[PDB]
Enzyme design. Structure first.
Site, PDB file in Angstrom:
ATOM      1  N   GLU A 163      31.579  49.348 -22.793  1.00 45.77           N
ATOM      2  CA  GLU A 163      32.206  49.987 -23.773  1.00 45.77           C
ATOM      3  C   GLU A 163      33.260  49.474 -24.586  1.00 45.77           C
ATOM      4  O   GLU A 163      34.368  49.569 -24.846  1.00 45.77           O
ATOM      5  CB  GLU A 163      33.180  51.211 -23.091  1.00 45.77           C
ATOM      6  CG  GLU A 163      32.185  52.264 -22.133  1.00 45.77           C
ATOM      7  CD  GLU A 163      33.131  53.440 -21.916  1.00 45.77           C
ATOM      8  OE1 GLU A 163      33.867  53.988 -22.637  1.00 45.77           O
ATOM      9  OE2 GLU A 163      32.595  54.057 -20.810  1.00 45.77           O
ATOM     10  N   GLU A 348      26.892  55.212 -16.634  1.00 44.57           N
ATOM     11  CA  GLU A 348      27.977  55.802 -16.437  1.00 44.57           C
ATOM     12  C   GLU A 348      27.700  57.375 -17.015  1.00 44.57           C
ATOM     13  O   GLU A 348      27.071  57.595 -17.976  1.00 44.57           O
ATOM     14  CB  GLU A 348      29.022  55.281 -16.928  1.00 44.57           C
ATOM     15  CG  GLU A 348      30.046  54.423 -16.108  1.00 44.57           C
ATOM     16  CD  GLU A 348      31.227  53.904 -16.905  1.00 44.57           C
ATOM     17  OE1 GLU A 348      31.638  52.766 -16.976  1.00 44.57           O
ATOM     18  OE2 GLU A 348      31.826  54.805 -17.917  1.00 44.57           O
TER      19      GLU A 348
END
Length: 444
Positions: A163, A348
């Protein structure tokens, strides 16, 4: 109903969020250590000094992963445990911890997935510019290189960064995450330098590695709050700034025009060398999905000037994230058309709901989390049905963890953690998850 055959089922963690023992065995401190220990910067001042004490309990956690019937485990490496100074001297106690972790994972039949950077940059390299200094590309490769040289045969699926958008937007634009920077000029610099470190690591791996390497981005679909021109433009501006800012460079599509529009004088185009080194061909891509954002224009929140609007009658989690499983489907199919037929792993996905501090009778009943898991697993299946070549799924998280500056109040784990006693307890979420793995989704 049925997932592709040999679909990889696993759970995901990150180094700082579970490991604890940040300074044991000669480990260098990270930016998150300095961050959590300066007063005022986190919700309750909760740290990762202990977290889930995973550093001392990795054998029990791996045994628990075998008990839950898991096939993969996604973790991150604390760079400061590898190079306490970020460069130079290598303390091999931490490197040995990671090698043992992978050893125990592999002798329980679990495929280890490694995140090399998951936000815990050593403080020594922060002292020398952090993600502002372009030498970071070199510093990353030498880090990554060593890791490959130790476990590239056994760890066979690597991710460079986790991320980058949360890294920059939280750590460099609004200072909500380590290392707490608040500057519009810095965020694009750190974004570029993150991508340059990514490309340099991919190149180093191509010279030294034989298996797979990829990248992990978060994606949050965007919806206009109204059909106003400014709400629509805000939604498209957030969509570019958040979803496309990193995949376009990695896949050699330059950077979005909205970078220039949003940042103005704070922005500069990348050089053809920068773009060329970023766009390194990779083997797989990991997508972190949780929710969508319904965007409204807000002049009061520059540079983006967009804000979130809660949807009435919609369901939200302990993090203010809407339950919107349709966005997962949308996200995967979108990635397919825009970026190609690269294999996709959901690295995720999960939810945080109000669980009690401890388990009674060895049970932790979390019906909301089970519900979210069902909806989103069905969404992944709908994507795979639509042509999306997804090969794996990683539930965030394996354990209730720290969740950064929000602290231990936000529990993502399918396994409950009694943080006062480090007692593991599989939640109802986890039992349904192991039913899902053994049946490969048929139970759904």
């Amino acid at each position: 109903i049925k997932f592709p055959d040999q679909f990889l089922w696993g759970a995901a963690t990150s180094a700082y969020q579970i490991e604890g023992s940040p300074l044991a065995d000669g480990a260098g401190p990270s930016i998150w250590h300095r961050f959590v220990h300066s007063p005022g910067l986190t919700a309750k001042g909760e740290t990762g000094d202990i977290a889930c004490d995973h550093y001392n309990r990795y054998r029990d956690d791996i045994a628990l992963m075998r008990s839950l019937g898991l096939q993969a485990y996604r973790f991150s490496v604390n760079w400061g445990r590898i190079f306490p100074d970020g460069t130079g001297r290598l303390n091999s106690a931490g490197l040995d911890f990671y090698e043992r972790l992978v050893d125990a994972l592999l002798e329980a039949g679990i495929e280890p997935l490694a995140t090399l950077y998951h936000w815990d940059l050593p403080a020594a390299l922060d002292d020398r510019g952090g993600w502002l200094n372009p030498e970071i590309a070199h510093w990353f490769a030498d880090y990554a290189g060593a890791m490959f040289e130790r476990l590239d045969g056994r760890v066979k699926r690597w991710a460079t960064l986790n991320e980058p958008w949360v890294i920059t937007d939280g750590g460099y634009l609004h200072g909500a995450l380590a290392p707490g920077h608040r500057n519009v000029f810095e965020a694009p610099i750190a974004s570029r330098n993150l991508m340059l470190a990514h490309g340099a690591a991919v190149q180093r791996y191509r010279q030294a590695g034989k298996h797979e390497i990829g990248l992990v981005v978060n994606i949050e679909p965007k919806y206009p709050a109204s059909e106003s021109d400014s709400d629509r433009n805000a939604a498209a501006r957030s969509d570019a700034y958040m979803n496309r800012q990193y995949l376009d460079p990695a896949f050699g599509l330059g950077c979005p025009t909205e970078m220039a529009e949003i940042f103005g004088p704070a922005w500069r185009d990348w050089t053809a060398e920068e773009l060329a080194l970023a766009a390194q061909p990779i083997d797989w891509l990991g997508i972190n999905y949780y929710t969508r954002g319904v965007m409204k224009h807000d002049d009061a929140k520059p540079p983006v000037r967009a804000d979130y609007v809660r949807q009435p009658g919609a369901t939200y989690t302990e993090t203010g994230w809407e339950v919107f499983e349709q966005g997962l489907t949308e996200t995967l199919l979108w990635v397919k058309e825009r970026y190609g037929d690269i294999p996709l792993y959901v690295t995720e996905n999960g939810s945080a709901f109000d669980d009690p501090p401890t388990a009674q009778g060895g049970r932790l009943e979390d019906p909301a989390r089970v519900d979210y898991l069902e909806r989103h697993l069905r969404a992944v299946h709908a994507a795979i049905a639509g042509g999306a070549d997804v090969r794996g799924y990683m539930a965030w998280s394996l354990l209730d963890n720290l969740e950064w500056s929000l602290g231990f109040s936000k529990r993502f784990g399918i396994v409950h953690i009694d943080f006062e006693t480090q007692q593991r307890t599989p939640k109802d979420s986890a039992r349904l998850y192991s039913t899902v793995i053994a049946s490969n989704g048929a139970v759904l």
